[PDB]
């Protein structure tokens, strides 16, 4: 019938890509790591334009937004129950098929409990064993202590939200509960303190827009874009909101009035936006300043 666009649709990818923008200075910020003496080349105006172009192609590969998944379902499956083995052992065995040419989500990992029950390993146990025999740089077997409440607040206080997302992407899987909680908590702190610029020109901006839209918290973001002369992104945010929520006061009103450009913000501001008054004032200031420049 009518399916609502997903996070990986070409239409949504292009919208979230444009909002993110491209900033080479922040995308390729000098890393604090082991250094080497740089290399120099004598280039022309055209050779410099091509090199700057190849950096744009490589930055769009570094800004690739990770896919957004739903919380994976627990694993509760028993392969066999051998009651004769009950009481013969004190601890449980964890068998792990280790074959190189197998994806880790198709890999068999079972557990023989002391009750003789041969079940499948839980998600927490699968991801742990896959790191013992197929280690990955950045991931640790034991959950770090940085992802705790008190420690995460410290990182937020230093405006290191992109660091928390990079730690979470290297330690947890996209469909894990911790990957979702840590991401969602970070998104809620930005909206509270208006730090939307931090995630700009990164691969974590789209996922942040996708969370506010589905939970209807685009008021703060929509304001920031207006305060930065980014109306094109501000209008695309309302267009996206209407798509995912067709049966909304703003969506229905827009169709009736056929609002376009700045009008969409006004229609959405009064009907559905919680901070309708503040938006109109902010949008008002911008439109006045824009008129002066046009003169």
């Amino acid at each position: 019938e009518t399916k609502k666009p997903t996070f990986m649709d070409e239409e949504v990818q292009s919208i979230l890509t444009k909002m993110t923008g491209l900033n080479l200075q922040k995308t390729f910020k000098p890393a604090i790591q082991e250094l080497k003496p740089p290399t120099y080349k004598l280039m022309t105006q055209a050779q410099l334009e091509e090199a700057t172009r190849q950096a744009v192609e490589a930055a769009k590969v570094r800004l690739k937004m990770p896919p957004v998944l739903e919380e994976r379902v627990p694993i509760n499956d028993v392969l066999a129950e051998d009651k004769i083995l009950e009481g013969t052992e004190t601890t449980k065995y964890v068998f792990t098929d280790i074959s190189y040419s197998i994806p880790h989500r198709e890999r068999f990992i079972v557990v023989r409990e002391p009750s003789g029950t041969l079940r499948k390993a839980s998600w927490e146990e699968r991801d742990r064993m896959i790191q013992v025999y197929f280690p990955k740089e950045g991931r640790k077997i034991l959950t770090p202590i940085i992802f705790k409440e008190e420690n995460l607040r410290t990182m937020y206080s230093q405006d290191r939200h992109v660091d928390v997302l990079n730690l979470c992407f290297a330690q947890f899987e996209p469909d894990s509960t911790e990957y979702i909680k840590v991401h969602h908590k970070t998104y809620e702190d930005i909206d509270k303190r208006g730090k939307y610029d931090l995630l700009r020109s990164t691969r974590y901006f789209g996922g942040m827009v996708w969370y506010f839209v589905n939970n209807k918290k685009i008021d703060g973001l929509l304001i920031d874009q207006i305060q930065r002369d980014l109306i094109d992104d501000a209008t695309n945010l309302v267009q996206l909101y209407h798509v995912l929520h067709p049966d909304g006061q703003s969506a229905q009103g827009a169709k009736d009035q056929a609002a376009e450009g700045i009008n969409l913000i006004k229609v959405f501001a009064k009907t559905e936006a919680q901070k309708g008054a503040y938006i109109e004032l902010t949008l008002q200031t911008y439109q006045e300043a824009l008129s002066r420049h046009s003169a």
Binding site: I32, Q33, E34, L35, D82, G138, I146, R160, F169
Partner: protein
């Protein structure tokens, strides 16, 4: 010597007694080792304090009892880390003893675990190419018949009492070397009350 900054060591670096002694340079700047030759030993002394007794030329950490190596004193731990590569200097670089260089590396790694010290965190790639849990390994498997009826996987797991004619053969086969016949085992494992 009882330092007043024992519990709050970060207050000594932001005081005037620290500025009048070190200034803006690190604590290990005006320190030189006493060794024979131009090339120094590749290891520093184990410790500058032996049974509450300090050596003639203590290291930058052992000479000032008000400098406490804690994971909270971020301003002191930054003097032992390169601001361009984020690498901890080896002891011969600064001149600290092995005992304090082992305490700094821990405190420096404990502050990076609490988010107090800034360090480079790369942007890694995903572990898996696909994210589909459409496989038996991660999903439910059709319970086998024997599992639904509460039966063992193979019939010969359970005890089966053999005929009498077969025991007589064994008794005849092993005459004078026998053991008391054992009956069917209990259904479940006993426990000590």
């Amino acid at each position: 010597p009882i330092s007043p900054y024992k519990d709050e060591p970060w207050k000594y670096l932001e005081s005037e007694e620290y500025q009048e002694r070190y200034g803006s340079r690190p604590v290990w700047a005006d320190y030189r080792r006493n060794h024979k030759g131009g090339v120094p030993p590749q290891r520093t002394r184990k410790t500058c304090i032996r049974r509450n007794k300090v050596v003639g030329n203590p290291c930058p950490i052992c000479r000032d009892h008000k400098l406490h190596v804690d994971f909270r004193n971020v301003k002191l731990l930054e003097q032992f880390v390169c601001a361009h590569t984020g690498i901890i200097f080896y002891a011969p670089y600064t001149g600290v003893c092995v005992k304090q260089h082992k305490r700094l590396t821990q405190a420096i790694q404990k502050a990076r675990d609490h988010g107090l010290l800034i360090y480079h965190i790369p942007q890694v790639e995903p572990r898996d190419l696909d994210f589909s849990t459409s496989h038996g390994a991660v999903s439910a498997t059709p319970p086998a018949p024997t599992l639904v009826s509460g039966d063992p996987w193979y019939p010969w797991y359970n005890w089966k009492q053999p005929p009498e004619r077969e025991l007589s053969r064994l008794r005849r086969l092993y005459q004078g070397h026998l053991q008391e016949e054992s009956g069917p085992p209990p259904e479940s494992m006993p426990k000590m009350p």
